[PDB]
Design an enzyme around this catalytic site. Structure first.
Site, PDB file in Angstrom:
ATOM      1  N   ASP A 351       0.842  -1.189   0.000  1.00  0.00           N
ATOM      2  CA  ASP A 351       0.000   0.000   0.000  1.00  0.00           C
ATOM      3  C   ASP A 351       0.881   1.244   0.000  1.00  0.00           C
ATOM      4  O   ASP A 351       2.012   1.205   0.479  1.00  0.00           O
ATOM      5  CB  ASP A 351      -0.933  -0.001   1.214  1.00  0.00           C
ATOM      6  N   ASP A 703      -2.096  -0.798   5.781  1.00  0.00           N
ATOM      7  CA  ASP A 703      -2.412  -0.202   7.075  1.00  0.00           C
ATOM      8  C   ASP A 703      -3.893   0.151   7.200  1.00  0.00           C
ATOM      9  O   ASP A 703      -4.413   0.289   8.308  1.00  0.00           O
ATOM     10  CB  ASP A 703      -1.561   1.048   7.307  1.00  0.00           C
ATOM     11  N   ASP A 707      -7.053  -2.400   2.493  1.00  0.00           N
ATOM     12  CA  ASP A 707      -6.024  -3.390   2.211  1.00  0.00           C
ATOM     13  C   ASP A 707      -6.389  -4.747   2.801  1.00  0.00           C
ATOM     14  O   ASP A 707      -5.748  -5.755   2.502  1.00  0.00           O
ATOM     15  CB  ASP A 707      -4.673  -2.931   2.760  1.00  0.00           C
TER      16      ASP A 707
HETATM   17  N1  ACP Z   1     -12.128  11.194   4.365  1.00  0.00           N
HETATM   18  C1  ACP Z   1     -12.165  11.366   3.041  1.00  0.00           C
HETATM   19  N2  ACP Z   1     -13.155  12.120   2.523  1.00  0.00           N
HETATM   20  C2  ACP Z   1     -13.199  12.302   1.197  1.00  0.00           C
HETATM   21  N3  ACP Z   1     -12.374  11.825   0.258  1.00  0.00           N
HETATM   22  C3  ACP Z   1     -11.406  11.086   0.805  1.00  0.00           C
HETATM   23  C4  ACP Z   1     -11.233  10.811   2.148  1.00  0.00           C
HETATM   24  N4  ACP Z   1     -10.120  10.010   2.343  1.00  0.00           N
HETATM   25  C5  ACP Z   1      -9.656   9.822   1.135  1.00  0.00           C
HETATM   26  N5  ACP Z   1     -10.381  10.443   0.148  1.00  0.00           N
HETATM   27  C6  ACP Z   1     -10.106  10.435  -1.283  1.00  0.00           C
HETATM   28  O1  ACP Z   1     -10.600   9.219  -1.834  1.00  0.00           O
HETATM   29  C7  ACP Z   1      -9.589   8.632  -2.682  1.00  0.00           C
HETATM   30  C8  ACP Z   1      -9.769   7.141  -2.721  1.00  0.00           C
HETATM   31  O2  ACP Z   1      -9.918   6.659  -1.367  1.00  0.00           O
HETATM   32  P1  ACP Z   1      -9.078   5.408  -0.789  1.00  0.00           P
HETATM   33  O3  ACP Z   1      -9.239   5.154   0.657  1.00  0.00           O
HETATM   34  O4  ACP Z   1      -9.476   4.160  -1.548  1.00  0.00           O
HETATM   35  O5  ACP Z   1      -7.540   5.702  -1.123  1.00  0.00           O
HETATM   36  P2  ACP Z   1      -6.308   6.249  -0.318  1.00  0.00           P
HETATM   37  O6  ACP Z   1      -5.307   6.942  -1.210  1.00  0.00           O
HETATM   38  O7  ACP Z   1      -6.857   7.332   0.672  1.00  0.00           O
HETATM   39  C9  ACP Z   1      -5.821   4.857   0.704  1.00  0.00           C
HETATM   40  P3  ACP Z   1      -4.298   4.026   0.232  1.00  0.00           P
HETATM   41  O8  ACP Z   1      -3.456   4.893  -0.628  1.00  0.00           O
HETATM   42  O9  ACP Z   1      -3.589   3.624   1.542  1.00  0.00           O
HETATM   43  O10 ACP Z   1      -4.724   2.722  -0.487  1.00  0.00           O
HETATM   44  C10 ACP Z   1      -8.273   9.125  -2.091  1.00  0.00           C
HETATM   45  O11 ACP Z   1      -7.233   9.097  -3.060  1.00  0.00           O
HETATM   46  C11 ACP Z   1      -8.620  10.547  -1.653  1.00  0.00           C
HETATM   47  O12 ACP Z   1      -8.452  11.477  -2.723  1.00  0.00           O
HETATM   48 CA    CA Z   2      -3.451   3.117   3.703  1.00  0.00          CA
END
Ligand code: ACP
Ligand code: CA
Ligand code: CA
Ligand code: CA
Ligand code: K
Length: 994
Positions: A351, A703, A707
């Site tokens: 991740d 984390d 995942d």
């Molecule tokens: N609390 C929140 N409210 C709104 N949008 C959010 C959010 N947290 C994340 N996002 C947006 O949603 C997108 C997709 O969410 P997701 O949880 O699947 O990816 P992520 O990049 O935050 C987790 P990772 O990179 O560890 O897999 C993120 O890239 C971010 O732009």
């Molecule tokens: Ca993460």
């Protein structure tokens, strides 16, 4: 202690006398702590029983020798041997070698458990609580949580205690209760009381149980019970036999041990058959069955020698040793086969956010719309100082600190960041640091609002506690958050429905404040806000916003970006169904663009170095994230997954791009692509699934809860210490250090284990075969016996015990992390390795026989007669065939049995020195890389010197120490066996990929 889940939400609050939004007062917490104790089970000090640890006598091999000593104990009690004392040494010698390995095995299992439990206590489990000394939610150690205080639970949290639900902030709440009820899928919870008092756990749908995980949603609750009164506390030691089974490698060796049993048994029976001629020989006089009893003793004794009795213990030792080494590097092993499997891992999935990155998020850049005039669009960009979650920083415009309240666009921007937020800030007094409560992404917005201070709120005269959420609380006092449409990774956005807090002076407009993935949010925007003004979304405006987003994410800082929008005219609440999450995107349309935020999220320092080590070790690394592809590719370049200008046109795919491919192309894409961005939790599991379809060992590192599916699917799931409990629950390893470098070390360590298990097998087989070959070589060539049932049990105790076991403490090979990952389905013994076992076993057999013969044929103290006992062994005394038989009693002489017994011991201690590495010479890997082995050799050699010079012992083991000149010959012939192996090692060194 409240024993009723049948009470209402009001009755629970009235019982403990606690305010719903404030929580227990410090004095209340004190009393409840005295009355109900700390929310801690003792953890039971009796993790194991000393003797229970001692039971290492379960393996087939230990049981064989166990029985083998018994028969020698029965053959010593009544007849079946004249001199009984020497026959009483036999079973005690066999017991001696077992206990030695037993002590070693017990010792390592002891050290492992201690080191494991010590590492498990390093990070105290924290919980989110509302308490009277703080307005905002605060984090405390879970053991300080008492029945009655208000506890907040969010997605990915381990439920700290048994909790009655008071309010669900989300539209739904799903919980993983598999640890208690065995329910595979998550279940839905509510706030209404369950009238039945005796209701089973599955029906307590208004309760959270300690040890369970919040699968989805956010809730407010009050603790009913803590400590041992907790549902999970009663059942921890209540039922048994829920423990783990033997590992794949261990099962592979179990198979191996039994096949050895069938061979040795055949050989032993064969030894009995080939020697049925000395049935009636004068040694036992004329004996029809007594002569068989002695050779039955020989067969049994030859088994004990040949049987790798140390094998069961050396696996458990190597494993416990690897765990303890991992424990020193702050890595928690939740599943035993995690280290061995990681050793043969070819692909490591990882991740990005929180795993490859430090997850210390701080908005450092943000913009709003400035001017819109036809094809022209200009933005008002801002910079934010402060890399921490601390509310200390400035908003810079043109490298000048500005008041964010001056810009109307920032006012609404801060409003969205504050309201559309399920996280907050809590100041930890211990070494004074502002800590995040919830997701790092949302907290970076919380600290932003504090830095912006759009309403010029007087914050100078506030404590560091109040300051954490000072500006945020002001905004919440201006708009009442009706409800929240939770963040969903399919729509990748989040919204909150809000009304003016006054509700008396203002009823002009309800609003929906939306934040989420830029691309998605912007597409659902039909209007663009310019200050307090609103203009239609057009091409030029859209291109301008997106291009700047592309700039930040690809830039040298690689900014994680979020778009912030507002629905000026949201549907009436009646037209909105909160049941289905799939219709939330519909509610989040016709939005008005407000701005875009940019977050700094530094990669972990040790990642870049670790990846190169993985690349050298033939391990491929793939980034899998839900973030924007531009930033993901940019980070991949920053950490070394991609070169700075590789131009990876077909090595990076979005979730959309990945799905547009056919199944055959998706499966093939996982082979070439090293970066997957904007992907859902299902995609992560599917990617790992594809890599395993090529018969690859796939490891997953994460984390978050996104995942979790991939963590359970992979061969090895590795979680971050700072990660969610859901991810840890789905893992085999946990890195409390959050140190990514440990993974590479874990891979390396597991291969040392396998190689050390190889050298153990290589030593015991090639040496004990030589013992067997010796017995066959004498009985066939028609020589006097080389060894006696007692002498056979001696070369076993000395050469198949500690010098064998000490090979488990071997250092890793020199090129251990420069060779590709071992295929999981590789033969335990290669086709060529088997040739060594014979090449070494052949000489050892020929060395032990040549020694006993040399005494007969060239010893000056011996007869010194030429070839083959004058062609036969018939002679015994004068008056038989007069073939120049000047010698009288040159048969049944004990000195050559020595000579064989001493060569056998020496040549095996000699052979053990070759078992330091698979193919590396003693030149590159000298004997002093393993001090533990040399000590076992010295102990074995000293034990042999002792048994020979302590005068009563030579009578027992039959040995007149022809000390000076003949030990030279013993040392002389035993020496080329390490010289030959050195030449033998050189071959395969150069033969296969020299
Ligand atoms: N609390 C929140 N409210 C709104 N949008 C959010 C959010 N947290 C994340 N996002 C947006 O949603 C997108 C997709 O969410 P997701 O949880 O699947 O990816 P992520 O990049 O935050 C987790 P990772 O990179 O560890 O897999 C993120 O890239 C971010 O732009
Ligand atoms: Ca993460
Ligand atoms: Ca043995
Ligand atoms: Ca041996
Ligand atoms: K798993």
């Amino acid at each position: 202690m409240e024993a009723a889940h049948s009470k209402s939400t009001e009755e629970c609050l009235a019982y403990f006398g606690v305010s719903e939004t404030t929580g227990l007062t410090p004095d209340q917490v004190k009393r409840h702590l005295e009355k109900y104790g700390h929310n801690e089970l003792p953890a039971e000090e009796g993790k194991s029983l000393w003797e229970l640890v001692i039971e290492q006598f379960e393996d087939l091999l230990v049981r064989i020798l166990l029985l083998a000593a018994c028969i020698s104990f029965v053959l010593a009690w009544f007849e079946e041997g004249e001199e009984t004392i020497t026959a009483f040494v036999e079973p005690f010698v066999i017991l001696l070698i077992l206990i030695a390995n037993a002590i070693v095995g017990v010792w390592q299992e002891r050290n492992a458990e201690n080191a494991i439990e010590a590492l498990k206590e390093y990070e105290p489990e924290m919980g989110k609580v509302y308490r009277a000394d703080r307005k905002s939610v605060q984090r405390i150690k879970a053991r300080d949580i008492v029945p009655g205080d208000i506890v907040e639970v969010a997605v990915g949290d381990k439920v700290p205690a048994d909790i009655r639900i008071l309010s669900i902030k989300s539209t739904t709440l799903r919980v993983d209760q598999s640890i208690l009820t065995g329910e595979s899928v998550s279940v839905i919870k509510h706030t209404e009381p369950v009238p039945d008092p005796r209701a089973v756990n599955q029906d307590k749908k208004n309760m959270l149980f300690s040890g369970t995980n919040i699968a989805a949603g956010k809730a407010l609750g009050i603790v009913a019970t803590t400590g041992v009164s907790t549902e999970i506390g009663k059942i921890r030691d209540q039922m048994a036999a829920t423990e783990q089974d033997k590992t794949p490698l261990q099962q592979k060796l179990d198979e191996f041990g039994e096949q050895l049993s069938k061979v040795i048994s055949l050989i032993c029976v064969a030894v009995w058959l080939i020697n049925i001629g000395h049935f009636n020989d004068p040694v036992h006089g004329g004996s029809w069955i007594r002569g068989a009893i002695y050779y039955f003793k020989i067969a049994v004794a030859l088994a004990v020698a040949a049987i790798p009795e140390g094998l069961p213990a050396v696996i458990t030792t190597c494993l416990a040793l690897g765990t303890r080494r991992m424990a020193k590097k702050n890595a928690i092993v939740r599943s035993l086969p995690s280290v061995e499997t990681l050793g043969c891992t070819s692909v490591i999935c990882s991740d990005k956010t929180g795993t490859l990155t430090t997850n210390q998020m701080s908005v450092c850049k943000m913009f709003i719309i400035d001017k819109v005039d036809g094809d022209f669009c200009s933005l008002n960009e801002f910079s934010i100082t402060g890399s921490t979650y601390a509310p200390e920083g400035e908003v810079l415009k043109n490298d000048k600190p500005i008041r964010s309240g001056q810009f109307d666009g920032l006012v609404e921007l801060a409003t969205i960041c504050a309201l559309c937020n399920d996280s907050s800030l809590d100041f930890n007094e211990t070494k004074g640091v502002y800590e995040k409560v919830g997701e790092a992404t949302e907290t970076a917005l919380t600290t932003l609002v504090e830095k912006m201070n759009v309403f010029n709120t007087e914050v100078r005269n506030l404590s560091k506690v109040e300051r954490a959420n000072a500006c945020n609380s002001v905004i919440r006092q201006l708009m009442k958050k009706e409800f929240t449409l939770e963040f969903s990774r399919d729509r990748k956005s989040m919204s909150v429905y809000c009304s003016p807090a006054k509700s008396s002076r203002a009823a002009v407009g309800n609003k929906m404040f939306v934040k989420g993935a830029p691309e998605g949010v912007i597409d659902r925007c039909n209007y663009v806000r310019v200050g307090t003004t609103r203009v239609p979304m057009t091409g030029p405006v859209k291109e301008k916003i997106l291009s700047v987003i592309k700039e930040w994410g690809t830039g040298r800082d690689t900014l994680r970006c979020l778009a912030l929008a507002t629905r000026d005219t949201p549907p009436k609440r009646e037209e909105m169904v909160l049941d289905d999450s799939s219709r939330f995107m519909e509610y989040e349309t016709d939005l008005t663009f407000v701005g875009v935020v940019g977050m700094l999220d530094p990669p972990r320092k040790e990642v870049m170095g670790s990846i190169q080590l993985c690349r050298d070790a033939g391990i491929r690394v793939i980034m899998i994230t839900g973030d924007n592809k531009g930033t993901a590719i940019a980070i991949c370049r920053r950490i070394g997954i991609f070169g700075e200008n590789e131009e990876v046109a077909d090595r990076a795919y979005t979730g959309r791009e990945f799905d547009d491919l056919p199944l055959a192309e998706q499966r093939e894409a996982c082979r070439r692509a090293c970066c997957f961005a904007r992907v859902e939790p299902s995609h992560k599991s599917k990617i790992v699934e594809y890599l395993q379809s090529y018969d690859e060992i796939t490891a997953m590192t994460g984390d978050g809860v996104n995942d979790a599916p991939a963590l359970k699917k992979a061969e090895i799931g590795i979680a971050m210490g700072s990660g969610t409990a859901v991810a840890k629950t789905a893992s085999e390893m946990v890195l409390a250090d959050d140190n990514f470098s440990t993974i590479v070390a874990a891979v390396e360590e597991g291969r040392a284990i396998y190689n050390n298990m190889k050298q153990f097998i290589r030593y015991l087989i090639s040496s004990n075969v030589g013992e067997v070959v010796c017995i066959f070589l004498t009985a066939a060539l028609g020589l006097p016996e080389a060894l006696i049932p007692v002498q056979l049990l001696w070369v076993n105790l000395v050469t198949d015990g500690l010098p064998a076991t000490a090979l488990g403490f071997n250092p890793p090979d020199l090129d251990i992390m420069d060779r590709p990952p071992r295929s999981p389905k590789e033969p335990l013994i290669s086709g060529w390795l088997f040739f060594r076992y014979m090449a070494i076993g052949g000489y050892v057999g020929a060395a032990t026989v040549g020694a006993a013969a040399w005494w007969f044929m060239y010893a000056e103290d011996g007869p010194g007669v030429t070839y083959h006992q004058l062609t036969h062994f018939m002679q015994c005394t004068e008056d038989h065939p007069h073939f120049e038989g000047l010698d009288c009693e040159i048969f049944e002489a004990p000195e050559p049995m020595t000579m064989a017994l001493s060569v056998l011991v020496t040549i095996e201690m000699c052979n053990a020195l070759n078992s330091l590495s698979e193919n590396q010479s003693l030149m590159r890997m000298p004997p002093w890389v393993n001090i533990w082995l040399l000590g076992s050799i010295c102990l074995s050699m000293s034990l042999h010197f002792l048994i020979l010079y302590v005068d009563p012992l030579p009578m027992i083991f039959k040995l007149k120490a022809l000390d000076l000149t003949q030990w030279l010959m013993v040392l002389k012939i035993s020496l080329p066996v390490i010289g030959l192996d050195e030449i033998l090692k050189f071959i395969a060194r150069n033969y296969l990929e020299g």
